[PDB]
């Protein structure tokens, strides 16, 4: 296993951005109930993109960008679980929540972009 094709990276990146775009829409339209399923679709898209790369990447920038990608997806998943408290309707700071959620998506997109750039420059 080596570096994936630019076409494959673009395909998985577009799935990530599409799902992030839907999350941003949910935040803006106050679909706070949609945060968990959105994050799951994002987390899945992230896993598939990460799987394009070797289990142990040789390139230092791939290692770094994958770390950011994976950590931010996990962080997002952690944040979105607050939209489904065990007691339905429990107090939640939706301003703080939305802020944290968008921060996570920002870094996911950031990492995804870096991976696109890395892949293209090696072709």
């Amino acid at each position: 296993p080596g570096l994936p094709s630019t076409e494959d990276v673009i395909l998985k990146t577009e799935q990530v951005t599409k799902n992030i775009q839907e999350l941003l829409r949910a935040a803006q339209e106050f679909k706070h109930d949609s945060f968990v399923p959105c994050s799951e679709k994002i987390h899945l898209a992230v896993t598939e993109m990460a799987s394009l790369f070797p289990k142990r990447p040789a390139l230092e920038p791939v290692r770094s960008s994958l770390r950011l990608l994976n950590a931010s997806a996990y962080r997002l998943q952690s944040e979105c679980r607050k939209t489904v408290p065990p007691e339905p309707g429990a107090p939640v700071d939706f301003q703080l929540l939305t802020q944290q959620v968008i921060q996570c998506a920002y870094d996911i997109a950031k990492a995804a972009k870096q991976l696109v750039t890395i892949t293209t420059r090696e072709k």
Partner: protein, 34 residues
Amino acid sequence: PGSEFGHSDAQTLAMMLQEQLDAINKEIRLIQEE
């Protein structure tokens, strides 16, 4: 490391996220033209 955003509001964050997404689409477009 992860990005530091301090106490940025959702409005500012949404803008920067959208800018990030726009940059990705623009880069992909540039790649598919060469």
